[PDB]
Write a protein that binds this ligand. Sequence first.
Ligand SMILES: [Mg+2]
Ligand SMILES: [Mg+2]
Ligand SMILES: [Mg+2]
Ligand SMILES: [Mg+2]
Ligand SMILES: [Mg+2]
Ligand SMILES: [Mg+2]
Ligand SMILES: [Zn+2]
Lengths: 191, 77, 52, 189
Amino acid sequence: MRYIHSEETIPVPENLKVSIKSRLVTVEGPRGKLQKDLSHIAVNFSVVKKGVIGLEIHHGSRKDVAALRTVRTIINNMIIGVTKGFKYKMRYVYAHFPINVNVEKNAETGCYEVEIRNFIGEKIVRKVVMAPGVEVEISKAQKDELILSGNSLEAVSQSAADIQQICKVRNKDIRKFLDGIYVSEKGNIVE
Amino acid sequence: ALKEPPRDRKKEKNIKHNKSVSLDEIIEIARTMRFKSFSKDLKGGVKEILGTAFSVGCQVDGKSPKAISDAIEAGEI
Amino acid sequence: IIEPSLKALASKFNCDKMICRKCYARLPPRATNCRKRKCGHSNQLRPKKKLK
Amino acid sequence: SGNKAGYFDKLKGLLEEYPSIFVVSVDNVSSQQMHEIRKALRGQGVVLMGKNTMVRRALKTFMPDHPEYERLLPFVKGNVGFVFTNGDLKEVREKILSNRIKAPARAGAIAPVDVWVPAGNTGMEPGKTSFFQALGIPTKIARGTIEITTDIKLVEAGAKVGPSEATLLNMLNISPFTYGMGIAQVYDQ
RNA sequence: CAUGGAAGUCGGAAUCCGCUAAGGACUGUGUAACAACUCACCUGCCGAAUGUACUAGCCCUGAAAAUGGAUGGCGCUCAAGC
Ligand SMILES: [Mg+2]
Ligand SMILES: [Mg+2]
Ligand SMILES: [Mg+2]
Ligand SMILES: [Mg+2]
Ligand SMILES: [Mg+2]
Ligand SMILES: [Mg+2]
Ligand SMILES: [Zn+2]
């Protein structure tokens, strides 16, 4: 079973610009610019209407057509991200031993780095380098919050996963020792 | 308020299923107090309701409250 | 002590999971088939029993 | 689909017998409201609404029993009910408008208009002052009663109401929502 | 009906009708018990397929031995495989 024609459309708001060349997408708007390369997928791009982009695959199989929506949702996420940004929230959870962190400022480059001390009462100092373009803040709204913000969802989420994955308990029952840092809510910078 | 005569004092620790009551116009007369509180049109539905309400008692003798309510053959009042 | 909402938040990542019966792999709570290849994508799963 | 079969003949019986049809736009209304309005109009008129009849009126349009049925084809959009009655149009203009309930907030309901608490004495138990201090409302306890010295804005119009303010609205018996039946255009009036 | 109390929700056995497209002698939580919340169920949006078992073709798990190694070798993927 080979499918003749499968098509979807993406609207574009009247605020930003997008240009595609040789399967390389450039999106630039009020909050910056992003680049992505999609040369590994055979897709045909076209301009359906004044503000609608269409893309399609011809004579594809079910497995090939399955990947068609993935680019659509990635491009939509980039469109949202370049006009509204992204924001993740994190909480610290300890029972007895407090954990203290220090998100020091730029280290002579755009990258931020986070220092974590006193995890389950350990004297190890553990060092993490954030992806470029992501801003880390200690919240002042109320206590025990870590604020992550940025332009790209992939970098914001991966950096959050780095923070989550670096605080691990070893040789203990993790159903009893619930210590660690976890993400609790994801959203946009505006509203 | 029937319960097959007075329930002797402290005679409820064991089974207390001896609450059989007669099935007659007495229940229909007692239904007039409710007077079809929740709609029931001209109270024919309320009459069937109250008649089948004592489903544990199984009406009187062979007749059953469910059979009596299901069979629409009695007078309205 | 841990306040209940934080305890639930932390437990959601390490208590509510499915366990494969062939390779002891951790699966999402609503999974129906194991994802690992050494067991052949088996559908013999059991819930992770809680601690009490 | 026993009720579906009973719906076909019941509807066919009522459409021919009642010449007058009134359209009602009911949406997100509590069941008790239709229970009470049904009991009020039990003697005269029967109200009945159901799923959208995409082709079920088109069948009445095909045969000539009522050439005016095909004139009402585009009027059905969604969540619109019909009222069959034999009373006059003037008397049925405001009969079904009674019993407008006072719907409380639902912890975040958008208030169309700014909600304000006028200066006065609540008169309730002063043990609830922690709720007032949660929002930081200046309250003074006089004679065991909580009194709001200065008016404090609750929520801006069109903005989400805070969960604490929405909860306080329940015992304060004040809310911007008043739910009632909606009247749509009937017979190209 | 027992009942501090158990208005469905220690419990016993029953399990009906009203009005609706649907909303229960109750689907749980909750609570002294209720209420409340939810659930079931129908409708508000929608816009054409779905669900449940079985059958057989290829591929994969099941598949662990000793000097370095053999579809005869290099190599081969709309094949130079079936
Ligand atoms: Mg040990
Ligand atoms: Mg299917
Ligand atoms: Mg050969
Ligand atoms: Mg060929
Ligand atoms: Mg050859
Ligand atoms: Mg061949
Ligand atoms: Zn497995």
